[PDB]
Design a protein around this nucleic acid. Structure first.
Lengths: 137, 84, 177, 49, 113, 61
RNA sequence: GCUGACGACCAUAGCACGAUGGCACCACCUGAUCCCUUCCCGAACUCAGAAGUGAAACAUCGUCGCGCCAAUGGUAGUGUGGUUUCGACCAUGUGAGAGUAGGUCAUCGUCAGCU
RNA sequence: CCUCCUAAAGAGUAACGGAGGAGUACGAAGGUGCGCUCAGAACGGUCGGAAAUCGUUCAUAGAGUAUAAAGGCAAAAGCGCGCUUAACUGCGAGACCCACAAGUCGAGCAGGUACGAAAGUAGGUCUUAGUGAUCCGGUGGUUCUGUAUGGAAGGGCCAU
RNA sequence: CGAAAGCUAUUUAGGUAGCGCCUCGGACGAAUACCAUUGGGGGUAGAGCACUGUUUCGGC
């Protein structure tokens, strides 16, 4: 369950998720990436489940890079509380995902067993994804 | 109220507006005493024809036209009054 | 200032020829000698500081300036601008006379003296030594002494390299090794 | 800081008014201030406000 | 150091430029002393006097007497150029000795400041 | 040098009597006897040491 | 041709490295009587001077190592009108930042002095 | 009441929105003239260390700014020293802000003053918080009034 | 002809008051609006890590 060690501020404005991932849309460290075609929030729980399912399938013969870090706190209001009376407490952390962003990179393994692990990970993620190769331009 | 997460972090204070900023812009006619910039510190510095108040307010020392420039080795923003 | 006269007479030329310097103005020379007597026990007794001032006045021959703390340190119980040391800067004939005295009368009176190590240069041709017992100087007298204290002697020279600094100090007969 | 009166020594009854710390300044203060009743700078002495 | 001297001259230089008056800048070296009068715009020299002038070139320059002569001569040159009211600019030099002697000579030989 | 703020500082004649080598220099030390030199007489300070003097077993039994 | 003073300008002007310069000028430099300096110190400031040196500094010259500057094209954003699956898209106007090619070891003014 | 953000690149702009401060301090911590430059890091050095004071080399501020934050700060607004009272009196062209009541900035003029050799600078403090209308009552001044008249009482005006 | 449901204040909050907005009368007369060209200041959208933080991998 990724989380910043410490933050400048506890709570954050909602913001907007708009635009394409012009940064982080490249397989940078690995040989094989899983990139998102849709936008949304990637919860730290989703990142942890996907990392577990890739690690199990690659079995300590390959290297994984997690390109997403959840650094946005999301507040939640408990049940049976009226509107107002101050912003709710932080319950979990997300990363903002734009269409195009690499989420996971794999290197040091066969293409087939990398595609299997990436498909397995995609199954646990709230995104339409695609598997991308490393090109050079 | 399940999870009791209604945590009071009470901060609803704010100060009154100060109405700072540029009052007269470049190329405008100006008479002596007219306030040009209200600011905190010297975001703009006083060049020829403009004076500086205890509040860092910039005002025309003489009549003319307001001119903005970047001058000096600190690349500072300067306001001048040109006799024109 | 017999050392001043002797340096301007023969030490300068022989240093030039020994270092193989091209320009007479490239020769190293001593610019200042600073005596420091930092007493960290001050601001809690207020007797040691005046004793050290008196001892420095006796040794250097100048009125020393009381150096005060540049910061607060809780570990040493030191606050801003508290007098915690003494320093005197000697230049010109005063510095040359002090150097002659330290070389000829003071350093030999150091108990268990085996020489001053030559690696005690800062790397810019400046030398520094520490005298553990100040009674080495004949000016201060053993009979009516307050207590045993030490001192720092820093020789700031015009040299730019450690070799030039050590050659300059060897020219005056400094006890190296 | 207590409020005190700095009164003209010219006897014109003119006074300035100010504040002071009676712990870092326990004596009565005195300054040369301008007296408009005689149009001169004279000594003003602290008095009780 | 000229860097420190120019650091400590800039306050007076900027205040004189704000005042918008002609300025009598001095500049002394161990050998010579110079005095020149600059326009309020700050980029025009309209009068000058140094110890490089032939009258006092081959003489005891670098001296308080030479400074007195240079001040006396620039006062005459300013008078002949139409300048009567300047602001003195010691240029970071202390107002003392040679600079003071030049200023007193210029102040007594017609220039008022 | 500021006047009337610095200590006494006058001539003195240190003398290493072991090697019998003199050292004429300015110092603040107040001596007792004023031994004469070639020029004149300065306060004289005797010195024990100075820079001119300071520097298997089986077969035996 | 060079030096100095004061400016314009404020990195394409800077940094770094190397080279040249002592007739003028500048800088170190000599001494501390005198003026004046130091919570101590002729270091700095100040004065009186020329025995010495361009060593340092400074000035000038060279270069692309850094810095700085910087297109064209594209992309992002965006005013107006329309559409929309709410992501955006179309018409029109506008148009970055980053990055790339490239550029740069400044350019001028007044006055004085030596040649 | 002050600072930041929300606040949509002029101003303004709400929420029981997100974060922090104030209800003071200072006769120097004000004025002026003169002078200075910080935090750190490494190397050397008696006690002495991770870090005291001393020396050196880099160091445009990675410091400081009485205090929160923002903005600013080398001509330093930061840090010293000498002398001082401009933390003046009468005002104020002209602006800013503003429902009003208030609030803010201000060259210049007169008089007296301080510092400076001078041109000058100075009407508090880097600035933006440190605040409370009127009534009533007190106090220091004042010829303005003074219920027949002269006073006085009381009232008014100026300061508090 | 033609609003407002705003700002400020209020023992105020569904009341009231100044201002804003409506109308009528008078004064004034282009000082107004639109567009073209043009002089300004900005820190938002976007973007980016130069600061404050935060993040991953490799080297050390």
């Amino acid at each position: 369950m990724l989380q910043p060690k410490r933050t400048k501020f506890r709570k954050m404005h909602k913001g907007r998720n708009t635009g394409l991932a012009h940064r982080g849309s490249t397989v940078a460290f690995g040989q094989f990436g899983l990139k998102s075609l849709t936008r949304g929030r990637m919860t730290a729980r989703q990142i942890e489940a996907a990392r577990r399912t890739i690690t199990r399938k690659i079995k300590r013969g390959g290297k994984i890079w997690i390109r997403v870090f959840p650094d946005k706190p999301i507040s939640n209001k408990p049940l049976e509380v009226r509107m107002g009376k101050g912003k709710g407490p932080v319950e979990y952390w997300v990363c903002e995902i734009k269409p195009g962003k690499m989420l996971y990179e794999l290197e040091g393994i066969s293409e087939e067993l990398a595609r299997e692990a990436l498909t397995l990970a995609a199954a646990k993620l709230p995104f339409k994804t695609t598997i991308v190769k490393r090109t050079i331009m | 109220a399940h999870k009791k997460a209604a945590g009071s972090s009470r901060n609803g204070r704010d100060s009154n507006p100060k109405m700072l900023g540029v009052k007269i812009f470049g190329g405008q006619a100006i008479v002596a005493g007219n306030i040009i910039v209200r600011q905190r510190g010297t975001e703009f510095h006083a060049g020829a024809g403009v004076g500086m108040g205890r509040d860092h307010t910039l005002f025309a020392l003489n009549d003319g036209v307001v001119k903005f420039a970047t001058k000096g080795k600190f690349n500072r923003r300067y306001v001048m009054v040109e006799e024109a | 200032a017999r050392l001043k006269a002797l340096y301007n007479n023969e030490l300068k030329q022989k240093i030039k020829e020994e270092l193989g310097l091209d320009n007479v103005m490239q020769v190293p020379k001593i610019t200042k000698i600073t005596l420091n007597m930092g007493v960290g026990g001050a601001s809690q007794d207020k007797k040691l500081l005046e004793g050290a001032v008196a001892d420095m006045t006796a040794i250097a021959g100048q009125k020393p300036v009381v150096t005060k703390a540049r910061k607060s340190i809780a570990g040493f119980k030191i606050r801003e601008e508290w007098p915690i040391g003494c320093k005197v800067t000697l230049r010109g004939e005063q510095m040359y006379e002090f150097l002659d005295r330290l070389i000829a009368v003071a350093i030999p009176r150091v108990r268990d003296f085996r020489g001053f190590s030559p690696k005690a240069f800062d790397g810019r041709g400046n030398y520094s030594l520490g005298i553990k017992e100040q009674i080495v100087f004949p000016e201060v007298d053993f009979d009516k002494i307050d207590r045993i204290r030490g001192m720092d002697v820093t020789i700031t020279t015009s040299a730019a390299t450690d070799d030039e600094g050590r050659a300059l100090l060897k020219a005056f007969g400094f006890p190296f090794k | 800081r207590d409020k005190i009166k700095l009164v003209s020594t010219a006897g014109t009854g003119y006074y300035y008014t100010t504040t002071k710390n009676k712990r870092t300044m326990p004596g009565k203060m005195e300054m040369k201030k301008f007296d408009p009743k005689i149009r001169q700078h004279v000594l003003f002495k602290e008095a009780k406000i | 150091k000229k860097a420190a001297r120019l650091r400590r001259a800039k306050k007076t230089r900027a205040h004189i430029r704000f005042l918008g008056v002609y300025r009598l800048t001095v500049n002394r070296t161990p050998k010579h002393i110079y005095a020149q009068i600059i326009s309020p715009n700050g980029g025009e020299v309209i009068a000058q006097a140094s110890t490089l002038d032939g009258s006092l070139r081959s003489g005891a320059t670098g001296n308080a007497d030479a400074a007195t002569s240079v001040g006396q001569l620039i006062a005459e040159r300013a008078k002949a150029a139409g300048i009567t009211k300047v602001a003195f600019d010691r240029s970071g030099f202390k107002y003392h000795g040679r600079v003071k002697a030049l200023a007193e000579a210029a102040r007594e030989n017609g220039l008022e400041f | 040098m500021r006047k009337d703020i610095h200590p006494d500082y006058h001539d003195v004649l240190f003398h290493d009597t072991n090697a019998d080598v003199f050292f004429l220099t300015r110092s603040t030390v107040k001596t007792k006897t004023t031994r004469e030199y070639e020029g004149s007489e300065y306060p004289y300070y005797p010195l024990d040491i100075s820079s001119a003097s300071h520097p298997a077993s089986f077969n035996k039994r």
